[PDB]
């Protein structure tokens, strides 16, 4: 669907590299966007939900862990958005850094809470789902051009 074009140029070799580069980049640019969004959405849901759980009241033990998770997710949501800005400036690296940070928040929450008696399913799943999502975004951020 691109060779059709390139073969008509006085320099197809150039064309292909360009059309394939810009196409790849555009593609990565889109997968990051969707991965980050899915991630941001789930982090936002888990964040409200934690804030709510804390509101509804829980034992001192669970309160503490759910409070640590809240701080991890507020910190993660900021980092995911920042990472989006780096994806935008084409700064895979800062993006990676930001995605890592976010991932660490999810992992730390996961750990602050996997030990609780009857943890909130939701918090747990979103936390693992988000670790997976950050995983993807981390990879994609590494494919971005650098000098």
Swiss-Prot record:
GO term, biological process aspect, one:
pollen tube growth
Query: GO MF annotations for this entry?
Result: pectinesterase inhibitor activity
Q: Which residues are glycosylated?
A: 125
Keyword terms, alphabetized: Apoplast, Disulfide bond, Glycoprotein, Secreted, Signal
Instruction: Please give the superkingdom of this protein's source.
Output: Eukaryota
- Location within or outside the cell: Secreted, Extracellular space, Apoplast
Write out the tissue specificity statement of the associated record. Answer: Highest expression in flowers. Expressed exclusively at the pollen tube tip.
Could you tell me which cysteines form disulfide bridges? Answer: 6-15, 69-109
Q: Does the keyword Magnesium apply?
A: no
Q: Which family does it belong to?
A: Belongs to the PMEI family.
Q: How does it assemble?
A: Monomer and homodimer. Interacts in vitro with PPME1.
Q: What does this protein do?
A: Inhibits pectin methylesterase (PME) from flowers and siliques. Inhibits PME from leaves.
Domain remark in the UniProt entry: The N-terminal alpha-hairpin extension is required for pectinmethylesterase inhibitor activity.
**What name is this protein filed under?**
Pectinesterase inhibitor 1
Q: What is the lineage of its organism?
A: Eukaryota, Viridiplantae, Streptophyta, Embryophyta, Tracheophyta
This protein's gene is called PMEI1
What stretch of the whole protein does this chain cover? 30 to 176 of 176
């Amino acid at each position: 669907e691109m060779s059709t074009i390139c073969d008509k140029t006085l320099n197809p070799s150039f064309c292909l590299k360009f059309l394939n580069t810009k196409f790849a980049s555009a593609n990565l640019q889109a997968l990051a966007k969707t991965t980050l969004d899915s991630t941001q959405a789930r982090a936002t849901q888990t964040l409200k939900k934690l804030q709510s759980i804390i509101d509804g009241g829980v034992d001192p033990r669970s309160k503490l862990a759910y409070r640590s998770c809240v701080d991890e997710y507020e910190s993660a949501i900021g980092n995911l958005e920042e990472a989006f800005e780096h994806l935008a400036s084409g700064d895979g690296m800062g993006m990676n850094m930001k995605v890592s940070a976010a991932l660490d928040g999810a992992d730390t929450c996961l750990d602050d809470v996997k030990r609780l008696r009857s943890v909130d399913s939701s918090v747990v799943n979103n936390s693992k789902t988000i670790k997976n999502l950050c995983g993807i975004a981390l990879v994609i951020s590494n494919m971005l051009p650098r000098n």
